[PDB]
């Protein structure tokens, strides 16, 4: 079988020099491969063609700090002075003729994490129900959480100071530049909204809780 093997993840300190490995199947150790860089839910970007003597051709928009090398079945992508912008999934690809037919295969991808970045406290934006939603006898509370780093957050809602869990609808954090974004919604009836004194969206990030409140008043 034609198989590319990559570790699923790898971690490097800011400014360090990083090396990623892709290993070809033994009977295909002389093969030329492609490296790609991919952001979540986006088309991959072509990084380079890498041949068995370790020579390579880099694609457009790839900076000088990326280069390649080889050692038998191993193909390496090296990034010197690794930047936060280099956080991505890296994937190798290879083509062959197998039983008279063209086949192309991708590796599993390696997720690269760049350690030692500056911390960033979440920005909370809260919105009360629009009067249009209230005319449908409904009420949705919106909590938008942005500009934070690292990606670990927990969101908790409160009504009149009491934790509540019914109607809460929280997303996973997702990447924006080198920061992260998340949203949380609280689905209520207009009656629940109007009968309570306050609601609070509470965000914990690195043992720091930040919070904002909404009132029907």
């Amino acid at each position: 079988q034609l198989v590319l093997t990559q570790s699923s993840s790898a971690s490097f300190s800011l400014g360090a020099s990083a090396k990623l490995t892709c290993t070809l199947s033994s009977q295909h150790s002389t093969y030329t491969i492609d490296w790609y860089q991919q952001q979540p839910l986006k088309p991959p970007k072509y990084v380079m063609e890498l041949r068995r003597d370790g020579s390579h051709n880099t694609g457009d928009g790839i900076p000088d700090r990326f280069s390649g090398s080889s050692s038998g079945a191993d193909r390496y992508l090296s990034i010197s002075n690794i930047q936060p912008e280099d956080e991505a999934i890296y994937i190798c690809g290879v083509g062959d003729t197998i039983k008279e037919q063209f086949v192309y295969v991708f590796g599993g991808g390696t997720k690269v994490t760049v350690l030692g970045q500056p911390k960033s406290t979440p920005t909370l934006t809260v919105f009360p129900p629009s009067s249009e939603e209230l005319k449908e006898n409904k009420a949705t509370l919106v909590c938008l959480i942005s500009n934070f780093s690292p990606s670990g957050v927990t969101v908790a809602w409160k009504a009149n100071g009491t934790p509540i869990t019914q109607g809460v609808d929280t997303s996973n954090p997702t990447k924006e530049g080198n920061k992260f974004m998340a949203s949380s919604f609280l689905h209520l009836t207009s009656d629940q909204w109007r009968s309570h004194n306050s609601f609070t969206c509470q965000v914990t990030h690195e043992g720091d809780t930040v919070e904002k409140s909404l009132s029907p008043a």
Binding site: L144, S146, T170, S171, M181, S183, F185
Partner: peptide, 9 residues
């Protein structure tokens, strides 16, 4: 502009 990805429920 900040567009937050959809949540499913």
């Amino acid at each position: 502009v900040h567009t937050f990805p959809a949540v499913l429920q």
